[PDB]
Ligand SMILES: Cc1cc2nc3c(=O)[nH]c(=O)nc-3n(C[C@H](O)[C@H](O)[C@H](O)COP(=O)(O)O)c2cc1C
Ligand SMILES: Cc1cc2nc3c(=O)[nH]c(=O)nc-3n(C[C@H](O)[C@H](O)[C@H](O)COP(=O)(O)O)c2cc1C
Ligand SMILES: O=c1ccc2ccccc2o1
Ligand SMILES: O=c1ccc2ccccc2o1
Ligand SMILES: O=c1ccc2ccccc2o1
C-alpha cells in the first residue's frame with residue numbers, strides 16, 4: 078500500500094507515509110516538558126509512524142499558547158528534549174518538532190480549563206504581542222500589543238535560537254508554525270495585520286516576517302535535514318480565492334527559500350468563518366498547493382480512516398498523511414492501518430515484544 | 437457496566453475491573469529493566485486499566501525464563517522499578533508485579549529467537565533447577581538438576597527478598613508465579629515432581645513448596661496490600677478431574693494462608709496435552725475455583741472482546757478480567773472497551789490531554 082512506502086526528504090528516510098502532526102499536551106511547567114511527554118512521545122514512536130512531530134514548542138515565554146505549553150527558549154529547555162528525541166530514534170521513527178509563537182492567541186487557558194484568554198488578574202497570564210493591536214474576538218478578547226521593529230528582530234532571533242537548539246537536541250525534522258492564527262499567520266493575514274511599515278500592507282510586506290524568519294532559521298538548520306512549515310492557506314472567510322492565490326505565491330517563495338515540505342492547513346485567523354469540516358476535506362486544497370507551488374505537502378483532519386489516507390496518497394494529493402486524534406485514541410494506529418490496508422506482516426509495524434504475539 | 441465498577445481488595449481500590457496480566461517483554465539486560473519497560477508500563481497505566489501487573493520478574497538469575505527477562509534479585513534491580521512504579525501510580529492505575537522462578541523451563545531463547553532451550557555452549561545459558569531431574573521435552577529438552585533441601589531453602593528466601601523489594605519499590609499488589617510449568621507449578625505436579633522427601637509424593641508434600649513460599653512471603657508483604665498468586669489448576673492431560681480437585685483444595689489452603697485473590701490458569705507442566713483454546717474458555721473453570729474455594733479470582737485468554745469481559749463479570753465467573761494481547765495491540769484498550777460497553781464519558785477513561793479531544 079502507498080501509506081506504507083518509505084519517503085526520503087533530504088538525508089532523512091521515513092519508514093512509511095504516516096506522520097503524527099504536532100499535538101499540544103498542555104502538560105509542561107514553565108515550558109519544561111516532563112515524563113508525560115516522554116512516555117507519550119516514545120509510546121507513539123513505537124506505534125509505527127514514520128514521523129513524529131512534537132507539539133507546538135514556544136520560542137519565547139510569551140509565545141506559549143497556555144501555561145502548560147512546551148518551550149525551548151533556553152538551553153535547559155532544549156536539554157529536556159534530548160532523552161525524548163533519543164527514545165523516538167530508538168523506536169525507528171523520525172523525531173521532528175514544531176517551533177512556534179502564539180501571538181495574539183497566547184496567554185490562554187488550557188482547553189479543558191476554559192480555553193479562553195486568561196483573566197488580567199490571574200498570576201499565570203501575560204501580555205500578548207502581535208502585528209497590530211487588534212483582538213481575535215470571541216473567547217480570545219485580549220487586545221495584543223503592537224510589535225516594535227525590535228520586537229520583530231527579537232522574535233526572529235528566538236526562532237533561530239529555537240531551531241539551533243532543536244538541531245543540537247537531535248531533532249531531524251523542523252516545522253515552523255506559521256498557521257492557525259498565531260504570530261506567523263497573523264503577519265500574513267490582512268485581518269490581523271494593519272501595519273504600515275515594512276511588515277504590513279502589501280503582499281511583500283505581509284510576507285516579510287515569515288520569509289525573514291525562514292531565512293534566518295535556514296542559517297542554523299542543517300541543509301541535510303527537512304526544513305518545513307505549517308501554513309494556513311485559506312480562512313473560509315469569503316475571501317478564499319484571493320487568499321489562496323497569495324498563499325500559493327508565498328508557498329512558491331518558501332520553496333525558493335529552501336522549504337522542503339509544507340504542512341497545509343486553515344488560517345483560523347479570525348472567528349467569523351464557515352469551515353466545511355469533513356473527512357479528508359483538506360485533500361483538494363492541499364493538492365492544489367502541491368501542484369501550483371510544486372512542493373511536497375501533508376495535511377490533516379479525518380485521515381484516521383486508513384482507506385482515506387491511502388486514497389489521498391494514491392491520488393497524489395499528499396506526500397505524507399498526518400493523523401492526529403486517532404493516535405491519541407490508539408497510539409498503535411499505524412498497526413491498525415497496516416491490518417486495514419492488508420499490509421504483509423502487519424504486526425511487525427510494531428516492535429518485536431508486541432509483533433511476535435499479534436501476527 | 438460491570439467492567440467499569442471499582443474493586444476494593446484489602447486497602448487497595450482499582451478504578452475498574454480491567455487487569456493487565458503479567459506479560460514478559462524479553463527486553464531486560466542481566467535482569468535490569470530499562471526505558472523499554474518504563475514507557476511500555478507507563479503507557480499502559482495511562483490507558484485506563486485499574487490494575488497493571490508487571491511481567492514475570494525472576495527472584496534469582498537462574499530463575500529467569502530467558503536472557504531478556506526482568507529480575508529483582510538485588511536491591512539495584514529493585515531500584516530500577518521505582519520510577520516505573522511511580523509513573524504507574526501517577527496514571528491512577530495500581531502497580532502490581534509477578535515474581536517468579538522458571539524452574540526447568542529456564543535458560544531458554546526469546547520467543548522470536550528460537551523459543552527453545554539455549555545450547556549448552558552458548559555463553560548466555562545456565563543450569564536449570566527443578567524438583568526432579570526430568571525434562572519438559574519438546575522444545576525444552578534440557579534436563580534440570582534436582583534441587584537439594586538447601587536449594588529449596590534458598591529459593592524460598594529469594595521469593596521473600598523479592599517480595600520485600602517489591603514492597604519497598606512501591607508495588608501495591610504482588611502475584612506469586614505458581615503457574616505455567618515453572619518452579620512452583622512443577623512442585624505441585626506429579627508429572628514433574630518425583631521426589632520422595634518432604635517435598636514430593638503426597639498432596640501435602642507436593643503442596644509444601646508453594647505453601648511455605650506463600651507463608652514466607654506473607655511475613656514481609658504488607659497485610660493491607662493484596663497478596664495473590666497465579667496457579668494452573670488443570671493440565672488438559674486426561675487427569676483433569678483428579679487434578680482440579682487437588683488444585684481447588686490447594687486454593688483453599690492458599691486462602692486460609694492469607695491469599696486474597698487467585699489468578700486461575702492452566703498448568704503447561706508437560707507438552708503432551710489437548711487444551712481447548714477458545715474465547716473466554718477459562719470462564720467455567722475459574723468460576724468453579726471461585727465457588728469451591730470461596731476465593732476471588734481472575735483469569736485470561738480472549739477477553740479482549742469487551743462484551744465477553746462484561747459477561748464474565750455479570751455471571752460472577754470472575755472478579756477481575758485480565759486482558760493481555762489486546763493491550764499490546766492497543767495500549768488504550770480500556771477506552772475502546774468503555775465505548776463498546778456504552779460507558780458514560782467513555783473518553784475520560786483516559787487522561788485529560790487525550791480525553792478532551794475524543795469525547
Ligand atoms: C490535542 C490536540 C493538540 C493539537 N496541537 C497542535 C499543535 O501544537 N500545532 C499545530 O499546528 N496543530 C495542532 N493540532 C491540530 C492537529 O495537528 C491536526 O491538524 C488536527 O487534529 C486534525 O487532524 P486529526 O483529524 O487527525 O486529528 C492539535 C489537535 C488536537 C486535537
Ligand atoms: C508477550 C506475552 C508475555 C506473557 N508473559 C507472562 C508472564 O510473564 N507471566 C504469566 O503468568 N503469564 C504471561 N503471559 C500469558 C498472559 O498473562 C495471558 O494470560 C495470556 O496472554 C492470555 O490472555 P490474552 O488472550 O488476553 O492475551 C504472556 C502472554 C504474551 C502474549
Ligand atoms: O521500537 C523499539 C525497538 C527496540 C527498543 C529498545 C529500547 C527502547 C525503545 C525501543 O523501541
Ligand atoms: O496550532 C494549534 C495548537 C493547539 C491546538 C489545539 C486544538 C486544536 C488545534 C490546535 O492547533
Ligand atoms: O494519567 C495521568 C494524568 C496525569 C499525569 C501527570 C504526569 C505523569 C503521568 C500522568 O498520568
Ligand SMILES: O=c1ccc2ccccc2o1
Pocket residue numbers: 460492501615616
Ligand atoms: O508465564 C509465562 C511467561 C511467558 C509467556 C510467554 C508467552 C505465553 C505465555 C507465557 O507465560
